[PDB]
Amino acid sequence: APVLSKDVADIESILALNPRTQSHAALHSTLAKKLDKKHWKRNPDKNCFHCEKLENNFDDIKHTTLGERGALREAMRCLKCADAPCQKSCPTHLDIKSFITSISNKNYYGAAKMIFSDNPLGLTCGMVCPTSDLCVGGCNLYATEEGSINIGGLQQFASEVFKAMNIPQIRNPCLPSQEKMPEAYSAKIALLGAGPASISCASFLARLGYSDITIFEKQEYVGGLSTSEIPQFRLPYDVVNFEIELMKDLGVKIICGKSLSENEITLNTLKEEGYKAAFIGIGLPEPKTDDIFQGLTQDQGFYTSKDFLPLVAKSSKAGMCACHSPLPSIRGAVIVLGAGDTAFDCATSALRCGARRVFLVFRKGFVNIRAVPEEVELAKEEKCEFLPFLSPRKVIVKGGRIVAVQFVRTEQDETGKWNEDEDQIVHLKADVVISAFGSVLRDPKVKEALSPIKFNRWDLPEVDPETMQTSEPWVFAGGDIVGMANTTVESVNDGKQASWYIHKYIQAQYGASVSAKPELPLFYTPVDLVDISVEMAGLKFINPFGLASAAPTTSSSMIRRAFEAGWGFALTKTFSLDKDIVTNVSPRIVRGTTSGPMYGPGQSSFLNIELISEKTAAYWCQSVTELKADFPDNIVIASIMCSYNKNDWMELSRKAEASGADALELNLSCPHGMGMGLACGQDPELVRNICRWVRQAVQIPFFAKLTPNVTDIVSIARAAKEGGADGVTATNTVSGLMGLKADGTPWPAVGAGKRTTYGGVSGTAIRPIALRAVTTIARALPGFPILATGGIDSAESGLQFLHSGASVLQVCSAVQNQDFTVIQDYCTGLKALLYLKSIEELQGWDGQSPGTESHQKGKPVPRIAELMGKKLPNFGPYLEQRKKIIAEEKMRLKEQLERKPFIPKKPIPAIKDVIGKALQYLGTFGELSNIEQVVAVIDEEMCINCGKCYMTCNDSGYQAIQFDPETHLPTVTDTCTGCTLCLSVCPIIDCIRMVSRTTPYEPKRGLPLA
Amino acid sequence: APVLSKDVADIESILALNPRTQSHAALHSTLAKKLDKKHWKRNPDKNCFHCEKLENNFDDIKHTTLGERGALREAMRCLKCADAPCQKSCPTHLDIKSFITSISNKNYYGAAKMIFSDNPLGLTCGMVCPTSDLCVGGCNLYATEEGSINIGGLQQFASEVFKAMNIPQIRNPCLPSQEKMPEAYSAKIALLGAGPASISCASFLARLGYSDITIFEKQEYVGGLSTSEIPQFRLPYDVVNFEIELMKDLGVKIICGKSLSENEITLNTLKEEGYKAAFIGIGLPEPKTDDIFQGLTQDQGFYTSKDFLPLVAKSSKAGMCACHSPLPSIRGAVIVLGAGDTAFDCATSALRCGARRVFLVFRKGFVNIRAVPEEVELAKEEKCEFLPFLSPRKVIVKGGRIVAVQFVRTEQDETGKWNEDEDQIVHLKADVVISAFGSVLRDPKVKEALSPIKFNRWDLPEVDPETMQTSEPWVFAGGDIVGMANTTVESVNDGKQASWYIHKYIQAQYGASVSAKPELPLFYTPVDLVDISVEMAGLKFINPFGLASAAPTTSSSMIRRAFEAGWGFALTKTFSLDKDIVTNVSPRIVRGTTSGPMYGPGQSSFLNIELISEKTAAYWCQSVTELKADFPDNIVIASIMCSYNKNDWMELSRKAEASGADALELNLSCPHGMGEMGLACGQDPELVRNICRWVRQAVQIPFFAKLTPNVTDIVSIARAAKEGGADGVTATNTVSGLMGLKADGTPWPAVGAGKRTTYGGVSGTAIRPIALRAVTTIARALPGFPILATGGIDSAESGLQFLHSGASVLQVCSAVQNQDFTVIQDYCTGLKALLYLKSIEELQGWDGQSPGTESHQKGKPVPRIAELMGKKLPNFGPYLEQRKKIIAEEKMRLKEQNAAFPPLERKPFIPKKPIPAIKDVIGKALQYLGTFGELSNIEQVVAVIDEEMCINCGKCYMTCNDSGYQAIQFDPETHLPTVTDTCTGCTLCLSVCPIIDCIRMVSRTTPYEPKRGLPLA
Ligand SMILES: O=C(O)Cc1cc(=O)[nH]c(=O)[nH]1
Ligand code: SF4
User: Fold this and answer.
1) Catalytic one among A670, A680, A691, A827?
2) Which end of chain A is less congested by CB atoms within 10 angstroms, N or C?
3) Are residues B448 and B367 in the same domain?
4) How far apart are CA B359 and CA B381, in angstroms?
């Protein structure tokens, strides 16, 4: 008999890289280290003077782009601040707190909805907004070592998920039907330029109800700058189209080929044609030119941002123009004049055109570059060179082409003025020159078409900063054309700003007034129509979510706000008869240590030694009458508690019913009085009796709130059904101790004696318990009403309890970790969930989570043949090979889809249709098939080489994984048993997956059987 | 009767900023936004062209510095990878995975120990290592949106906490007593230069046992470059002293004032004096000079890094020079020639001296700057200007002061060669010039003192890259002097590398040989002597940690490795008689959703539908015999399980004892198929008592009953087992629960195409609150009755919590499923530290290994400036502007004082009481537990916020608003909270505050009066 407790040679070999603590310090010469360091390099080599080749490489280079996995973490990291500063720093006032809350809750739709409600170009802004100088600039978390929240990427993600769902926009469902709309709304509205400004504007105008909105775009393409100049590698043209279509869904009309200039469209022709109001949003169409570049042409090698960028655009953006154009042939040293943010897109774009080298030359110093840092960094990392303090003077042309640019040094004196020493000339070689000095409105033909609107000193139309109204009442402008906005988000806000007032004006013209306070509509989709109401025990809940008798319902005042927020129902904190008045101690509510030293938002649990309500039954019953008086459709349930005494239970239960309570909830946490547990809720007999007393006392339905601290909850659940209860609430907090300091003292620690008692654990940490409890009671007493409580904190989790047999969902800890508004997330979230169950083309998704696609850092993994199954991890020499292979592919491709909405191909389920549907899958252990075994399969393309799966299987598994010592890539061997631990600890979602075993399974007995 | 369910005017006002969802889109003009944006600005203004004044401001500017709260997050974020690449990228091979794991477990000492075991200059390296180019460069987490782990900061922190503990170093406790050490070790060893290289080297040499080690430092100060040049705002001099002292604890001797020169100290004088071996670590003492700077002097405004930096050092580093040193007066435009990393310390430092403007001028392009990025950004952000493609040619002087520097343009031709166009001259104004072209060894007096060692073509001593041995067998070199190392960490490693071989050589000279495989000692402290053994039920545990009957013990082969790792004891996966052989399904083990969508390390729980062992009792029993045969001191406990049948329980239980098992554990998870206390045996006291009786009469070795938590009263089953004869109980097993469903309603784990499942067991940290109660409750009911705790143990500290609650030994599982067997090292060194600190009087304000939290921001202490406290200036917008002004004013004030700052008094903390032993702490926490009635409701408290620590999120505000008593005011301009007198001390806010110890509960000074809503009759 070999030595059973010793690894065989084969296995000892497989464990070669498994962690083992050393007994001595390691010896490795500095030289050996140097040589070896290059193998694992993951980031840029500061000693590398080049970088891969980027010719015709328009892959997304944004550092902010996030994948689901990563979106969820950051979303969870967000503090979700009150009166958040990031929103104050956002041009369109996006409720960041809210949409980010929705994301951490996996309610992407809700998040997407919140973003587009205030920003029609949500997806685009999330990709281009210079967040560092806007929202992220005020991020509270900037005051932590970890830093500010990547608001931008988070917005990008939620919007992207939403776009993928293929849901159309729809007018507010509350608006009167088309025909019933006042005359005023049919006025002909016109917008010039299909840019952010105009797209934003027309959208809001359409939301308000206006039926005749037309946008006149000069070019053949829409989207303005977002299409004509911003790089494909920063903002995909596909995104623009997405947002444009969303607009069209509301009827907005776009007509390309029409321009605003004398002989074409003019304020007069429009007035003459019957247009009641017009929004000018053509931006700054022409490049800022300079003398020294006169006569120069593209053939020679001269461009202006306005010339260059649009060419690369049209070339790299499939769908922009019908004509597939070439990618400008830029070879040799390129010189971009200027340090504006545009200058940098030119620089980086130039490299995609084949530029050998690119120099950014500005007339000031480095510290004077006012382009957003994030933008500069891209250039700098793609190895663009910088040359400061140089002002252009001459473009030396020899042989019909440019060969050099002549500069002159600049310098800043005491007073802080800039001088140019005309003595110190400078010759810089150059094969191409691109000037990024800016854009303006010069064309007198256009300037005229705007007569007689008054122009300011900047030679731009003048508008009231608040109304966006020009000198002519029916004419408003906004965006770049006005000169205030320096961003997409700001121009979008301009269109938006203007929309309201254009509305105010048009209405006035029809002798109609508008509210005093601005009421621009929110964003709406068919999802918002889904019905999430439910009936339980004869009670009609407008929506399944409610506040559970706890902290969130300490005062009736709170419940009121709760209802105002939109909560389906609520429980009054548990109250009792005067003789049982209680008095709380302090501290009494503490955070959970169930998830480690993680402080802030999203605590995995709480523990509390708080007693019932300290407020009198008088207070509560009055409060109940009040509440039900002002909120007749919100269900109010009174939570009452009495000792084991029939008269008491009947007295109190009648009093509550008398106040108007829709129903009652019996708090069975009181002591029996003799030494099953100490509490009433633990003894079936007692439970049954208390339930009888109340049954005979009142007529309104009442439910028993069961405790989970019992050997069999189904028995007390049954005893209450036998006692007359109309349903059970499952479950109350799990008893436990939340911890001790190193000194042995507890927490909470009451009084100077630092004492405490067993408290109740609430939160996500007890969901597994409440869930079992609900699913067990649901199979034992089918149909019997269950109000679930315990770890519900999102629409998805709440759906889980519905699927487990619950009809309504109680919440507490989730609101202690946040606030009443989460209700908005819950409803919009549950709606989305049910709505998606009707979309056939989206069955590969898990709720609102699309199917995970092989990606690295959130961005997809290139499907190049020369890369697949080559075992090239993303580090060291392997990464070098990857980049080459990828560049080779781009060059090969250089040598080388209608957006329709998804229609529900089935009726949208209703709460009742989903309650308990998950029960079918539950069974005993014997009903689980042990012939249908599985094994783990790793996707090397998604793996981050941590080796976690390796270690789990090594010290908690079957040593069935090989971990290459050079590529740090894992490979599950066929000794795998499919326990599923690895998958469980993989830090990359869906990198590891369980698949059906193809070979015969044979248990490991160690020693054969007799 | 006012309207009770309506907020009164005052409260509606207090809720003004409370969140409420909007009904319509927001209307805010683009202009209004612009004006408002500057009020919340937190980060730099891309439009502002000037960084606050930094004159005489040597505060820490490192972006990596971490505080405990922050260190704990990052530590937890670390994947703690296998064969970690970051370690491979570390020149000292620091077991990063391990020390970061210890940090995440609050075991700072263990962390600190690990780091110093491989890097005697741990604290320094953690602050200066150019991680981007080293360890961090290969961090797997770089492949995530969040990015690579701040290894440097993590090391800094652990080191910093350790330094605070004031614990001395001691020689390997397993080395023979001083007098019993061979002659060889008394050899006179000498090292030149008290720099990182030498400091590391001597240290290791001293660790090996050598008793005569002396370092000859030229200057009057120690620490080398780390003292003379690296900025105080990057590396505080008192860190250097800390590490030097740690060395001295090992006997190493340092003598300043002695130099290695042809006049005084030389290889020959040393040999003649009797020194058996010498290590050269003098670095590159001289600055690289250029002709164009001939004749220029400091008075004119010229310096070389070697001239300038040491001046600012001596002036800004209290404790370096005893003498009072003037802070160089640098006014006007400064020009730093070079783009080396030193060039940048010069730029930043220059600002501290009062420079009005600083220009970094290099002869190549921006892409050609070879300084690590983190270092470059420092300058860039303090607004230093850059001027590329310029080579110096002449320095102009007028009045005897510099006033300009003449340059010539440079450029690259298509062949990649750099040319300097002598025609294009450049006049650049300048009041001061500092050349940072590098350092070298030229002084022929020194080069001579090294005769006859052979020099290579770089004009530096030549040494075997592996042995660090020069042409002369008794002489080794390392660090900068050799020319390979570019970092502190690398020079440390050189000293280290050289140490071993110096060892090998010295031994040989005494006719002794050394192991084939290098055995450099680890780092040791008195804490490592702490005794963490414990006796329970007659069994002697070498340490209380052990593997609980589960996955980590699926095969005896694993238990073996576990013992090899050092685990005190282990449980065999539960096994039964042949007739009860089981077969598992799959999937069967899944991650917990108890902590949200957090994937990777540190799972809050696991749920599993795994049955007992699939391996035969034959296998186990032989395995037990083999295990106990090889590991006599490691307790092996067999976990057995049989139906409710006396013969079986007695058969199996005897077979187990027969194999040699130290004790047995009864798995009472088999059903008792008898009608209607649930279905399992462990849920019925009668059945538990009986099974315990059967086993009591069958065997003699102690056995325990592993109680299940899924019972209405666990104490009853615990008593029933004590009555049945058991020698103790294990508490508790997994909690029954369902881990969740997908959107489609199907569960997970989902077995078969039918996607079915059953109620599984929840394990991990998510059930610790249950297991702890279970333990503390059985501990008070049956005092003295042995309890083997199990349920959420994942660190020394948590383990100590179960000892404090009455458990004597701690079982582990989920924690190893989340990691691996080596966690044991963390646990032991952790528990050690804990008990050890309990005897230190001066560290009572701490909570275990956590120092008392100090008012901070982003991990840095808050300046206690009189004109800054209670002024309500939050760290954002114009308030931040005022703060910075007030702080610069304070620095200028401090300069006008020129007060010399008293030297360093680093004295070790001595245990002023015997170090407790496990027995001395078991159950000590039980005294505080009581009923609710024993809780005083007259000793009420309220929350009090530290505005200096607050990050203005407003979470406390929202908790108290929708889950509290609307007791907090949240200013609309400073976003600073203020708890009012309406507070009841519920403590929810403190619970949700994201900043540790920002909110604290204090004794209520105003009388407490419960809110009844409506008065009583
Ligand atoms: O146990 C807890 O944590 C909270 C609680 C207190 C109480 O009196 N009743 C109840 O149902 N729950
Ligand atoms: S000692 Fe330096 S090179 Fe090594 S793990 Fe630490 S910070 Fe990285």
Assistant:
1) A670
2) C
3) no
4) 13
